[PDB]
Paper text:
The MaPgb* structure can be considered as an expanded version of the 3/3 helical sandwich typical of “classical” globins (i.e. Mb), with an additional N-terminal extension, built by a 20-residue loop, followed by the Z-helix, which precedes the globin-fold conserved A-helix.
High-resolution data (1.60 Å) on the MaPgb*(III)-cyanide crystals were collected at the ESRF synchrotron facility (ESRF, Grenoble, France), and the structure was refined to a final R-factor and R-free of 17.5% and 23.8%, respectively. On one hand, the cyanide N atom is linked to Tyr(61)B10 OH group (2.84 Å and 2.71 Å, for chain A and B, respectively), on the other, it is hydrogen bonded to Trp(60)B9 Nε2 atom (2.98 Å or 2.99 Å). The rotation of the Phe(93)E11 side chain allows the rotation of the Trp(60)B9 side chain of ∼90° towards the center of the haem distal site. As a consequence, in the MaPgb*(III)-cyanide complex: (i) tunnel 1 is hindered by the Trp(60)B9 side chain, and (ii) the Trp(60)B9 Nε1 atom is at H-bond distance to the haem-Fe(III)-bound cyanide ligand. Interestingly, the 149–154 region, which faces Trp(60)B9 side chain on one side and the second subunit of the dimer on the other, is significantly divergent in its Cα-backbone relative to the ligand-free MaPgb*(III) and MaPgb*(II)-O2 structures (maximum displacement at Ala(151)G13 of 1.75 Å and 1.64 Å, respectively), and shows signs of structural heterogeneity, with Ile(149)G11 and Thr(152)G14 adopting two alternate conformations. Thus, ligand binding, and the consequent relocation of the Trp(60)B9 side chain within the haem distal cavity, appears to release structural constraints at the dimeric interface. Cyanide binding causes also a shift of about 1 Å of the Tyr(61)B10 backbone toward the interior of the haem distal site, with the concomitant side chain rotation of ∼90° around the Cβ-Cγ bond.
Author numbering:
A (entry chain B): 5 to 195
B (entry chain A): 6 to 195
The structure:
């Protein structure tokens, strides 16, 4: 077991439902075509996750105000916090590509939003760190997530057209998830 | 353009140029993107009517999106759509041509306020739904980029150049929706 990873065992139901998920998928233009290519993206990314993790956390680590969210109160990075989260982020890459986007998935999406938010941040790993990740950065991060995935998607010799489809699927699926994560941040009734 | 008040908003944004610098860093937006978004402008400018049809065609294709433009009777308000269309058209140019300075930031606060319940329906003085749910503003980052993509290639630029214009557009669209979140986000959580 991955420490802290509680997919399918959240014991709180998400405040958004499967119909909400359907309508949100429509808003990010996500169809059965993207179901085919997000799973293909998984097949491509799964063997490269160590270098993907290094690239992603290298980006976070290169900006003081982003690495900030993993720091101890004294301003120094908490490497145990970073390492524990890294294992769950690694799993998230596989989940995004491999899970059915069903109620169990939606319950975990609510959980992931809660963990970035002050509601549950720092509780999973029992660490002491900054209390909230400003929402502005969750949205911002849609971009660098997609930009870090893009080069890796080419590395199994899929055609340019297939790589482009895998990248677009990833983009849709990343946007969809960050939308859902906004829930605990948004003024009640405005989501 | 009716309702377009860029430069003359009379609220200062609650985020500042330092906040903008840090958020640009989070979406990997640099001077290179400033150059390529300007080029994207040059490419898109004379294609705006097709862009608009493609964009509002998508909104109009799903009842739960077209909803945000509807009158109480559930039918689209055509006055509202028409007036917004002109400002959206201008936004394509503003995104490409404006310096992302304080006046830009102030208008980004305003655009967020106008999607949000705070100022929605007020600019055009229409009776419509009170709030655009935030979930959709984030969602719409994707369709904005997928709408621009094919037009970015229509003036003969190489795939390498189209990709730079496209990535710049993506970054700049994500940056703006991040700022538009402000009025939606619980105080202290942004
Ligand atoms: C597209 C946006 C983002 C994605 C896809 C993403 C992905 C993830 C994932 C998959 C996890 C682990 C979830 C789990 O516990 O199973 C996580 C946790 C975490 N992420 Fe992100 N994240 C994003 C935004 C951000 C931002 C902007 C930061 C700021 C540095 C950040 C820093 C963290 C931190 C500090 C945790 C640990 C939260 C906790 O205490 O539980 N994330 N992220
Ligand atoms: C990336 C996301 C989005 C972008 C780039 C965008 C762009 C714009 C722009 C440029 C305007 C005019 C702003 C001005 O007054 O100068 C506007 C207004 C408007 N948009 Fe969006 N928009 C987005 C999300 C959405 C969504 C999800 C909807 C839902 C259908 C929507 C529906 C509307 C409506 C109803 C108005 C008029 C609001 C008012 O009463 O002033 N927009 N949008
Ligand atoms: C988050 N990583
Ligand atoms: C907005 N359109």
């Amino acid at each position: 077991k991955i420490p802290g990873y509680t997919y399918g065992e959240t014991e709180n139901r998400a405040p958004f439902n499967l119909e909400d998920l359907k309508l949100l998928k429509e808003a990010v233009m996500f169809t059965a075509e993207d179901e085919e290519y997000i799973q293909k993206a998984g097949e491509v990314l799964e063997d490269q996750v160590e270098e993907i993790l290094d690239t992603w956390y290298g980006f976070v680590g290169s900006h003081p105000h982003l690495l900030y969210y993993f720091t101890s109160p004294d301003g120094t990075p908490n490497e145990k916090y970073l390492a524990a989260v890294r294992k769950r982020f690694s799993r998230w890459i596989l989940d995004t590509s491999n899970r059915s986007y069903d109620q169990a998935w939606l319950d975990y999406q609510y959980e992931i939003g809660l963990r970035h938010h002050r509601t549950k941040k720092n509780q999973t790993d029992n660490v002491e760190s900054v209390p909230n990740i400003g929402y502005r950065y969750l949205v911002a991060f849609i971009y660098p997530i997609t930009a870090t995935m893009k080069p890796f998607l080419a590395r199994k010799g899929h055609t340019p057209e297939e790589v482009e489809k895998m990248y677009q699927a990833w983009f849709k699926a990343t946007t969809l998830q960050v939308a859902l994560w906004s829930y605990p941040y948004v003024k009640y009734g405005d989501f």
